[PDB]
Design a protein around this ligand. Structure first.
Ligand SMILES: NC(=O)c1cccnc1
Length: 208
DNA sequence: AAGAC
């Protein structure tokens, strides 16, 4: 059976993504990504989105494969003013860290009741690219690196050190420059015109 | 363009 690494190679996956409010970025670039449970245990300040955590795994960090969860992301941009950023993360996390793989949002009733052990591993990862995910039929032109359902999720049950963050995307140049000054060894990227296909876009538009 | 229960 194919390994996680083999699937990455075959599908041309190059990026994992994690959106977050800019309020969190200093702390993430300093300390790495941490779960809600761990931030609470360390008494670290953070700005979270979800007030329910219906997934049931507050000790896990949520990532996306190849494109952010543009639906949940846009919701929280409407609800929380200020700049949002998108962390780009090495696909190596998928094998190097303790990951569970979900073909849709990890809070969905379609996936959250399954034995967590069945969601680890290459078989669970391959399911993110299935021809039909709980009624979403994969488009025949969707490129190989994209999940069938834009909300497909990775839950990472340990910390992600900042060396796995390969770049960070900003919604304006000033935001990127601010963080570049503070973190000169890191890559801080930005869009000048947000009227464009950007990682802030819905995926169907981005790939259109 | 607005998850999840
Ligand atoms: N922060 C994230 O990128 C995220 C959160 C919830 C679901 N999928 C991704």
């Amino acid at each position: 059976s194919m390994t996680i690494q083999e699937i990455i190679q075959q599908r041309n996956i190059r990026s994992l993504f994690h959106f977050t409010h800019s309020d969190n970025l200093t702390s993430i670039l300093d300390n790495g990504l941490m779960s809600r449970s761990e931030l609470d245990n360390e008494n670290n300040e953070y700005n979270c989105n979800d007030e329910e955590r219906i997934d049931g795994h507050p000790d896990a960090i949520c990532l996306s494969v190849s494109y952010p969860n543009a639906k949940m992301f846009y919701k929280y941009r409407c609800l929380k003013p200020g700049d949002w950023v998108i962390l780009e993360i090495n696909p190596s996390v998928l094998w190097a860290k303790d990951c569970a793989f979900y073909p849709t949002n990890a809070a969905s009733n379609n996936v959250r009741f399954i034995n967590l052990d069945l969601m680890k591993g290459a078989e669970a990862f391959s399911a993110l690219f299935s021809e039909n995910v709980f009624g979403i039929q994969r488009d025949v032109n969707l490129p190989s690196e994209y999940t069938t359902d834009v909300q497909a999720a990775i839950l990472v049950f340990e910390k992600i050190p900042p060396s796995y963050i390969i770049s960070t995307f900003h919604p304006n140049k000033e935001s990127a420059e601010h963080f570049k000054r503070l973190y000169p060894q890191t890559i801080q990227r930005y869009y000048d015109n947000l009227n464009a296909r950007t990682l802030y876009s819905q995926r169907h538009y981005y790939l259109g």
